[PDB]
Write a protein that binds this DNA or RNA. Structure first.
Ligand SMILES: [Mg+2]
Ligand SMILES: [Mg+2]
Ligand SMILES: [Mg+2]
Ligand SMILES: [Mg+2]
Ligand SMILES: [Mg+2]
Ligand SMILES: [Mg+2]
Ligand SMILES: [Mg+2]
Ligand SMILES: [Mg+2]
Ligand SMILES: [Mg+2]
Ligand SMILES: [Mg+2]
Ligand SMILES: [Mg+2]
Lengths: 63, 67, 106, 141, 206, 143, 58, 145, 70
RNA sequence: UUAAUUGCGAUAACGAACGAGACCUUAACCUACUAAAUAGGGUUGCUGGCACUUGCCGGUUGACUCUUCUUAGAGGGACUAUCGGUUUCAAGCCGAUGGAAGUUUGAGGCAAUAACAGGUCUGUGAUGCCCUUAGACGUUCUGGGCCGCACGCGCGCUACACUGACGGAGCCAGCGAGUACAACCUUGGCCGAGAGGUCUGGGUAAUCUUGUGAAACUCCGUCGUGCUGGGGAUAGAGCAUUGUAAUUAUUGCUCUUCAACGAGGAAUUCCUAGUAAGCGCAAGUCAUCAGCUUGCGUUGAUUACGUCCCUGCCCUUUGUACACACC
């Protein structure tokens, strides 16, 4: 199973229809300086390492 | 939620206006000074005022502030 | 000619603490002026008297409850003394609100 | 005449007076020694401060604890706290201060309270609630 | 090496397992390193503890909960259900038993096994309920390390509790089995199955 | 050095006491043994029928040794606990009143327990010696 | 005479309250306000405040 | 302490006092399966017989069983205080009566009949099919007998 | 009742045979292998615990763990 | 931004007040002060038990001094402090360090403006009016009843097991409250299997009940996933106890009978730390009764540390033919 290990540079807002998600711009561990925004479920700070299968897909502010 | 109230801030401002000298940056001395000069019917309130004055002093080192 | 040591307890009970404290201080000062061996203004577990009640006269609202409390201050002042000196002391040494009480004898 | 301190240990309502004198190496709690205690699992907790600085700092200092308040767990914790304090106090008083500082460092890098006393006490269980916050049951039915 | 004695007598074994090494309940806290990238620090180890019980306040700010020992966390999770509310002692005992069982099982560091279990059962990407009008459509989302860890911790315990109802297999044994299943990823334990299901759900929305 | 008495891990001491009692044969059995609930919060007596009362006695003696002026009421309180009250929640009701008294009497007869002033019971000197011996034996068993 | 200290104090308070109520009722024309009880050995002083002191005196 | 061996000296699955005594149960709590036979009472009986509390219910010597039966019949003949009984000082006969097996039910029925005859409040309630011990049924138990 | 909590000689013999070369010697484990009850298992263990063979790891009540001699 | 009309800034407003805050009581810190044969701890008398050597462990109000713990008194103490960046380097918020204590330090107490035709005339010698009034709705005795059951709903408690169960055995609080003119809290000792009684007390109370030796919890054995030893429900029998009075068990314990219930459908309640939940105790009641309330400890976590999606409110902008205001 191919896994792409993400890493936080900045938190780009708490979101969701309710509150259980967070827009986060990420520079993943290997092959750095590529910024992709992903929505994250749990509590996240700065330099947090994130486990994900599907890397190169962007999700917006949820309705 | 530790936003200092109007009253405390006002008092601090007044103190700074009237006694800009004798406010030696650090808390402890400043607190005592506040207790001496300003008449506060409390202790906690006085402390708060002292803290705010110290903050103001710190600010006023790094430029001029409005009011 | 007398001077026979009895050892006398003084009770100081009240509510308004400041007054009580003042009285205690006064007593100690008086003891000092008559110069006697004495144990201090010994303080006991300041008994609170709690009465908790429905705030509602009639039981039709939310269940609001109030604890009406009575702070009490019990003080022992022990004297190594005869009785005459104690009597002399207790001629004055009375201030409003505070209870002055002499237990007398060891 | 002996070099000795009287230390307190404090958690919840448990209080523990450990007396730190000088002698062979006796560490007792309520007459019985340091070994027993008997929540059984929490035994190793009381062993922790001792372990941290070693058995060497006990062949000189004797510790004797009297514990009131609390329950079992709390009592254990209080004892632990007391023991931690006692050694430190002794070092501060009679032994060199470098040793004391080292002890402090060891404790602070492993701060399971100890030299810092426990903070929390219960909120008062106010009216309209079976617990402190926890209310009864509103029933708009 | 070197048993220094006192007036109050301590058993020999205890003396042996003391000063030389910064140990655990009886064995090595040392070694035991995280095989997986990420989740390090957020799966504790690092700071040596000698028991799986602290008064240590952690539910104070936010990211402090991810500095609480793994064994301790397990014990805490075990305290679930009303019959088991509070009773940390019991939980600690259970954890000890589990550790012993793991030790018995083909040697190895039990702590390491536990860590592996925690890693394996943690779901990667999960669906959250998105509004978008009225219908309960779900859009899959990346899960932060801490949350993942928490979920993993929960899941094993839940599985154990499920097992423990009407069984000679006392909870500890069940927990150990679950851990083993997680570590040797065979998808036979509850936790792993649940994780798989979640992943499937995510896929059906990705 | 010094042979200690309090330093025994509880249960072992009690067991030793029981064994000693069994060996001696001198106690005088209450008679209402086994035909009793022992505690007011009991549905079953002691499980092992014969013995266990001996253990209880030993425990009582140990408690006496530990403390100062100790009485029947306190003993009852000690050996009470939680009542299975069915639909109603537990309370705290004490142990059987006479049994403890009988035990105390038996102890007095043997010479373990002595009558104290002010109101209660303490330890006899021969009794103390016996206790010490028991402790020593326990230590030997451990060492 | 003599009860538990707490109890005694409570009783005294109650007495004071009763007295106050009585004065409100009885001295209505007298323009009464407050009672100031002073309990010493033998002589218990009871101070009473009013607007129309003359009426109270008689 | 030791496992009971031998090929088959003692027979499994018993039938004692008009009813059934199932094996694989240690002494006492298979005798509770007997209608009316006690826990404490059972223990006392066992003690009187002189049996260890380590045996199985699917064992027991015949002599022992006989002894047990004898103990069951009369509480007075053996060292039993006998105020642990269904009928102590009694409602009619005035002796010591702890009924056994399929007889307790009969006794109960007889008592009920007597009550009915007398026409006491309790009896009336029984007739109705309701609640004896002043228990109220404004809310609880909405199916009943 | 689910049986297999009897006595017998054959069962004892089987137990005797099922002792060397095993990772676990636990009460729960024994129960799982469709053998004697919880208390009986302990007794059986004790009978084999005379000259080596089976050695303890934990001594706790209802959570006992034993292992073979190495 | 804030818990906040809390503040900063923008700005025909400026400076104000009430409310929020502040304040107040309590809970936390003081090895610095004030003192304690009513809280404690030490050294030595007398001796008790040892190892048998000096040393331990004690008890004993003997003497002496201290005050850490206990208690209060007086103060002090945290002011988001110290940097780290963020945000106009405003207001502030987050992270580390120190610190007893960095969620308004926790918990309240108090609580504006106007109200609602909200609740009580059953708390009243608080009450306008109407009613009734002496073969009375005034009174008082005797008895029942407010506790009935075909069945609705809402508080709760106990259970549905091996995180057990029962014995043992270990053994730990904190609030409390408690009589002389009476029928209190009641130790301690003999008799009773319990329930209890009795002779002596001690306490108009840190001193006695009381270390309230509470439960939950911790060790060993016995039974091991059976409507079973889980569960103790419908029930008979004695002895007690309360009160003139217990049947419609007041309650109590003992033997028995030993049922419904194998984790609860639709809905939804409560909760963000000593918090939830567990587990008792005490008081309120009270002649007698606790499953209830107030309180207090005792164990003691999960997961947020957000957002308006649902629910409720709030303000703005909008429209209104309503203003007894959408019933
Ligand atoms: Mg139960
Ligand atoms: Mg910032
Ligand atoms: Mg506040
Ligand atoms: Mg109305
Ligand atoms: Mg009227
Ligand atoms: Mg009614
Ligand atoms: Mg209600
Ligand atoms: Mg007390
Ligand atoms: Mg049954
Ligand atoms: Mg009620
Ligand atoms: Mg228009």
């Amino acid at each position: 199973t191919p896994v792409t290990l993400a890493k936080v540079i900045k938190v780009l807002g708490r979101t969701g229809s309710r509150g259980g998600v967070t827009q986060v711009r990420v520079e993943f561990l290997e092959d750095t300086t590529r910024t992709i925004v992903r929505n994250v479920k749990g509590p996240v700070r700065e330099g947090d390492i994130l486990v994900l299968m599907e890397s190169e897909r962007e999700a917006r502010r949820l309705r | 939620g530790r936003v200092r109230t109007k009253t405390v801030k006002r008092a601090s401002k007044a103190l700074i206006e009237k006694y800009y000298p004798k406010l030696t940056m650090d808390f402890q001395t400043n607190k005592r000074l506040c207790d001496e000069i300003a008449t506060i019917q409390s202790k906690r309130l006085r402390n708060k005022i002292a803290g705010y004055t110290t903050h103001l002093m710190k600010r006023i080192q790094k430029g001029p502030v409005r009011g | 000619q007398e001077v026979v040591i009895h050892k006398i307890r003084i009770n100081l009970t009240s509510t308004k603490v400041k007054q009580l404290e003042n009285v205690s201080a006064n007593i100690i000062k008086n003891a000092e002026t008559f110069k006697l061996v004495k144990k201090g203004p010994v303080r006991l577990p300041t008994k609170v008297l709690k009465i908790s009640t429905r705030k509602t006269p009639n039981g039709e609202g939310s269940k609001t409850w109030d604890t009406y409390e009575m702070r009490i201050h019990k003080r022992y002042i022990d004297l190594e003394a005869p009785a005459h000196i104690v009597k002399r002391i207790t001629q004055i040494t009375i201030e409003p609100g505070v209870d002055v009480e002499v237990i007398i004898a060891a | 005449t002996v070099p000795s301190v009287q230390t307190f240990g404090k958690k919840k309502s448990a209080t523990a007076v450990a007396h730190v004198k000088a002698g062979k190496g006796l560490i007792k709690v309520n007459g019985s020694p340091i070994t027993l205690v008997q929540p059984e699992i929490l035994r190793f907790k009381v062993y922790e401060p001792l372990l941290l600085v070693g058995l060497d700092k006990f062949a000189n200092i004797d510790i004797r604890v009297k514990v009131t308040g609390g329950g079992h767990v709390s009592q254990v914790y209080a004892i632990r706290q007391a023991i931690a304090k006692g050694l430190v106090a002794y070092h501060q008083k009679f032994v060199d201060e470098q040793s004391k500082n080292e002890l402090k460092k060891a404790f602070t890098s492993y701060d399971r309270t100890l030299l810092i006393a426990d903070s929390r006490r219960p909120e008062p269980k106010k009216f309209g609630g079976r617990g402190a916050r926890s209310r009864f049951q509103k029933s708009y039915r | 090496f070197v048993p220094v004695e006192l007036a109050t007598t301590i058993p020999v074994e205890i003396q042996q397992a003391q000063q030389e090494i910064k140990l655990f309940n009886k064995w090595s806290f040392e070694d035991v390193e995280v095989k997986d990238a990420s989740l390090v620090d957020y799966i504790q180890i690092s700071k040596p503890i000698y028991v799986a019980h602290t008064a240590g306040r952690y539910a104070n700010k936010r990211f402090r909960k991810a500095q609480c020992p793994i064994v301790e966390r397990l014990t805490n999770s075990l305290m679930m259900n009303g019959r088991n509310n509070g009773k940390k002692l019991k939980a600690v005992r259970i954890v000890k038993h589990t550790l012993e069982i793991i030790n018995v099982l083909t040697d190895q560091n039990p702590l390491q096994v536990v860590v592996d279990a925690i890693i394996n059962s943690g779901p990667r990407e999960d669906t959250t309920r998105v509004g978008g009008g009225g219908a309960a459509r779900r859009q899959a989302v990346d899960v932060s390390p801490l949350r993942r860890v928490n979920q993993s911790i929960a899941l094993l315990t839940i599985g154990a509790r499920e097992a423990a109802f009407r069984n000679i297999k006392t909870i500890a044994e069940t927990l150990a089995e679950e851990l083993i299943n997680a570590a040797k990823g065979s998808s036979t334990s509850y936790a792993i199955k649940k994780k798989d299901e979640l992943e499937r759900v995510a896929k059906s929305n990705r | 050095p010094g042979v200690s008495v309090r330093d025994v891990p509880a249960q072992d001491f009690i067991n030793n006491y029981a064994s000693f009692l069994q060996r001696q044969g001198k106690l005088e059995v209450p008679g209402y043994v086994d035909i009793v609930k022992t505690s007011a919060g009991n549905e079953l007596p002691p499980q092992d029928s014969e013995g266990w009362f001996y253990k209880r006695a030993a425990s009582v003696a140990r408690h006496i040794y530990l403390r100062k002026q100790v009485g029947v009421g306190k003993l009852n309180k000690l050996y009470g606990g939680a009542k299975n009250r069915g639909v109603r929640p537990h309370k705290h009701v004490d142990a059987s009143g006479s049994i403890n008294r009988k035990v105390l009497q038996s102890l007095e007869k043997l010479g373990v327990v002595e009558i104290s002033p002010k109101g209660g019971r303490r330890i006899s000197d021969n009794g103390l010696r016996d206790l010490d011996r028991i402790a020593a034996a326990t230590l030997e068993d451990e060492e | 005479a003599i009860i538990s200290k707490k109890r005694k104090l409570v009783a005294d308070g109650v007495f004071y309250a009763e007295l106050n109520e009585f004065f409100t009722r009885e001295l209505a024309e007298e323009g009464y306000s407050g009672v100031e009880v002073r309990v010493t050995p033998t002589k218990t002083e009871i101070i009473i405040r009013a607007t129309k002191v003359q009426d109270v005196v008689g | 302490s030791l496992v009971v061996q031998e090929q088959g000296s003692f027979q499994h699955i018993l039938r004692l006092l008009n009813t059934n005594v199932d094996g694989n149960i240690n002494v006492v709590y298979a005798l509770t399966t007997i209608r009316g036979v006690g826990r404490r009472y059972a223990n006392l009986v066992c003690k009187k017989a002189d049996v260890d509390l380590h045996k199985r219910a699917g064992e027991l010597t015949q002599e022992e069983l006989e002894r047990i039966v004898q103990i069951m019949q009369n509480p007075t003949h053996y060292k039993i205080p006998a105020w642990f009984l269904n009928r102590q000082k009694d409602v009619n006969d005035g002796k010591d009566y702890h009924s056994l097996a399929n007889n307790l039910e009969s006794k109960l029925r007889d008592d009920l009949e007597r009550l009915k005859k007398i026409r006491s409040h309790r009896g009336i309630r029984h007739f109705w099919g309701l609640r004896v011990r002043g228990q109220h049924t404004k809310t609880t138990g909405r199916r009943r007998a | 009742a689910k049986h297999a909590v009897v006595l017998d000689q054959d069962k004892f013999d089987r137990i005797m045979k099922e002792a060397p070369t095993y990772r676990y010697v636990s009460v729960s484990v024994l129960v799982d292998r469709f053998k004697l009850g919880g208390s009986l298992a302990r007794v059986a263990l004790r009978h084999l615990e005379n000259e080596g063979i089976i050695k303890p790891v934990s001594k706790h009540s209802k959570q006992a763990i034993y292992t073979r001699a190495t």
